[PDB]
Ligand binder design. Structure first.
Ligand SMILES: O=C(O)/C(O)=C/C(=O)c1ccc2ccccc2c1
Ligand SMILES: [Mg+2]
Ligand SMILES: [Mg+2]
Length: 715
């Protein structure tokens, strides 16, 4: 049946065909040697993979029981800390070291700027994401609420000159702030010229050059009347498009048509928490998109990947700039199996092992010429993000897996670099050892704060009721965790060598708020942080022109700003903390978020969705926010904050609101036949079984229920 026997493996035919016919040709890897490598790697590494997962359960069971046996008041932290040390949860911190990762591209070692995450299963989005290296500041300002729609500046079907003028003014001020003139303002410019390799800006009364002429990077067209002027600030490029004949430029005082920002410097093509992929068919769809990205020929009806950009040097020679975002791929973590391959006993193969083999194989195409130039890493690297690891031994195992894949693929050792997510507590409190375990492969650490919050709730599930979800962002543990991550990175030598990353902005319509708030991340020394869209990448790029991250990192060096005691501060709520109506709001809010995400997950296979919340804020939800919401409610049910009747009532009450919030044409209602809705029952199960899920992970239930929905839709 539908499977191909190779050693101990029974490969789903759709995957077998995909690899042989699409992924392997062009790599010089022998098909029989590849599949023999798969069989061998899977056989050799599956035992340690399973033992690691069992170690998680052993540790969690010990912590569960420890909390249940606590008599004394507030927790004795000294006792808690030595208990975590006794059981091997808290491990010794290694001696200071510097990472040795080599052959890494400048977009990662040096350039500070936005990092975009996109669901790899969506080809149109992945294409737009790869092309997001450059984006229009004007469109990002006009399209969003960064420019208020107040005083006659409202959007309409047709262009609004009042609004367009505010856009232009906003951009002119950005130029003044980023690439200052020697005297005067870009707002008063009437033209641009190059004279003796030097940019000259025409004002009404005089001319002027740059306060720092080094920021002039090039131009297009004739030096005497350029079609564009290219600036650089903090390593990020700014392009002023000069076109007096265009509509916008006809009204502009210097003919400027647009300001283009280097935006998404890197992009993470995601197989994990923003996608729903539960079998071989789903996995192949994403592998195929990843292949089209690396081969350079991905296309949708036609939209294609961009080629590099051509410029004239200030001195008159020619040069070129990367036109695409440098691509990472995020593999799944150590937990799940997938029946795309099963062994002779019918056991599913570990999906993380498969992702390393297949995404690594496909990535070879990005290292070589696309039928023009090489698509991705000019320095020879493959960039893999590995999520949800717990502790240094799990990092060491990921590195061993990459070493074995490199052997199968015939690649140099350490070709496969690792972006480490710091999004589980046992990685947080052992982060230095985790970095050291990958000292010759690591290209970033990143605080995956949403997963980290889920793991915070589950780990201390037995300790008592936790604070409400909105309170987590300001809890002591999470502030220490964010600072602890930057300290570890800089102390391991990340400045100039590897990104220090922070987390995702989820409120896709609140771009004014993002431009106001998200500047805190570069200000905290992060050389990158996550945005959900190309538009958001362009606006987040403003922050890197305001903040000199390299300076910030230099000033943070050698500091030790989080103690182990702060990292271990459990977000327990104080008693009597909430009125009944606050409890009710938190329950309704979490049930609505779960139902809104799960219904598109189970019914349509969408893993990241714009879901409005109880205050009608549009949130771009992924699986990690589902882990938080379900674990919180499970924690509140576990300690008697809420009853089973409250949960069921809230779910039933919020489900028709979700039914209505969708209406779209593919959508099917959950109300009123709740016991007939797989998606409703999945939502219920995520809550009522949440405390029994391993580390609170949602994939076991989501996968099972999505597969169930698939099986019913087929018959
Ligand atoms: O905080 C972590 O745990 C972390 O991993 C978060 C994400 O993965 C994430 C969150 C929101 C998204 C929205 C649109 C596309 C992708 C997304 C990815
Ligand atoms: Mg995560
Ligand atoms: Mg500066």
């Amino acid at each position: 049946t539908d499977r191909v026997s190779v050693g101990n493996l029974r490969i789903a035919r759709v995957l077998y065909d995909f690899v042989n016919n699409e992924a392997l040709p062009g790599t010089d890897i022998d098909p029989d040697s590849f599949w023999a490598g798969v069989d061998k790697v899977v056989a050799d590494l599956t035992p340690q993979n399973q033992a690691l997962l069992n170690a998680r359960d052993e540790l969690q069971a010990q912590i569960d029981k420890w909390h249940r046996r606590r008599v004394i008041e507030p927790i004795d932290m000294d006792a808690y800390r030595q208990f975590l040390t006794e059981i091997g949860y808290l491990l010794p911190e290694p001696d200071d070291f510097t990472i040795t990762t080599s052959g890494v591209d400048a977009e990662i070692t040096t350039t500070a700027g936005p990092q975009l995450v996109v669901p790899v299963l969506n080809a149109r989005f992945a294409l737009n994401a790869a092309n997001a290296r450059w984006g229009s500041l004007y469109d990002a300002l006009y399209g969003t609420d960064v420019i208020p729609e107040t005083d006659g500046a409202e959007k309409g079907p047709t262009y609004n000159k009042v609004r367009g003028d505010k856009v232009i003014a906003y951009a002119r001020k950005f130029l003044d702030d980023s690439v200052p003139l020697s005297s005067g303002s870009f707002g008063d410019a009437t033209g641009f010229t190059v004279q003796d390799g030097q940019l000259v800006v025409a004002l009404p009364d005089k001319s002027t050059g740059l306060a720092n002429p080094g920021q002039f990077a090039g131009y297009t067209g004739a030096a005497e009347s350029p079609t564009s002027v290219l600036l650089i600030n903090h390593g990020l490029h700014i392009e002023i498009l000069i076109d007096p004949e265009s509509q916008v430029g006809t009204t502009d005082r210097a003919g400027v048509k647009d300001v283009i920002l280097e935006s998404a410097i890197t992009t993470i093509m995601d197989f994990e928490d923003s996608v729903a992929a539960v079998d071989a068919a789903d996995k192949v769809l994403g592998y195929r998109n990843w292949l089209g990205l690396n081969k350079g020929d991905l296309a949708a009806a036609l939209r294609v990947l961009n080629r590099d950009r051509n410029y004239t040097a200030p001195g008159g020679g020619q040069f070129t700039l990367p036109g695409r975002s440098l691509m990472f791929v995020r593999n799944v973590g150590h937990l799940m199996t997938n029946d795309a391959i099963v062994d002779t006993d019918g056991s599913e193969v570990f999906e993380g092992i498969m992702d390393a083999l297949f995404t690594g194989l496909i990535a070879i195409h990005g290292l070589k010429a696309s039928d023009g130039p090489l698509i991705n890493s000019r320095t020879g690297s493959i960039y893999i993000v590995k999520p949800k690891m717990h502790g240094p031994a799990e990092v060491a195992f990921t590195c061993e897996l990459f070493s074995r894949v490199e052997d199968v693929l015939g690649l140099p050792q350490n070709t496969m670099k690792i972006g480490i997510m710091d999004e589980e507590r046992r990685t947080t409190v052992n982060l230095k050892a985790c970095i050291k375990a990958a000292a010759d492969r690591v290209v970033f650490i990143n605080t995956g704060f949403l997963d980290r919050t889920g793991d915070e709730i589950h780990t201390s599930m037995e300790a008592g009721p936790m604070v409400r979800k909105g309170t987590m962002k300001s809890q002591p543990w999470i502030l220490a965790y964010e600072d602890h991550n930057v300290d570890a990175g800089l102390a391991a030598g990340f400045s100039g060598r590897a990104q220090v990353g922070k987390g995702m902005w989820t409120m896709t319509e609140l771009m004014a708020d993002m431009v106001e708030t998200k500047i805190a991340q570069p200000r905290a020394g992060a050389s990158t942080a996550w945005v959900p869209s190309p538009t958001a990448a362009t606006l987040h790029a403003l922050h890197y022109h305001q903040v000199d991250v390299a300076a910030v990192q230099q000033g943070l060096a050698g500091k030790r700003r989080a103690t182990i005691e702060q990292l271990l501060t459990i977000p327990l709520a104080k008693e009597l903390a909430w009125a009944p109506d606050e409890i009710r709001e938190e329950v309704d809010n979490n049930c609505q978020s779960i139902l809104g995400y799960v219904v598109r997950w189970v019914d349509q296979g969408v893993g990241a969705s714009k879901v409005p919340d109880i205050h009608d804020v549009a949130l771009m939800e992924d699986r990690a926010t589902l882990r938080i919401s379900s674990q919180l409610l499970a924690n509140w049910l576990r300690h008697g904050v809420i009853t089973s009747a409250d949960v069921r009532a809230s779910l039933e009450r919020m489900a028709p609101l979700v039914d209505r919030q969708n209406a779209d044409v593919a959508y099917r209602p959950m109300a009123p036949n709740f016991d007939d809705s797989i998606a409703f029952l999945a939502a219920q199960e995520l809550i009522l079984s949440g405390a029994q899920q391993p580390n609170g992970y949602t994939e076991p239930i989501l996968h099972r229920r999505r597969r169930e929905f698939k099986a019913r839709a087929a018959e």
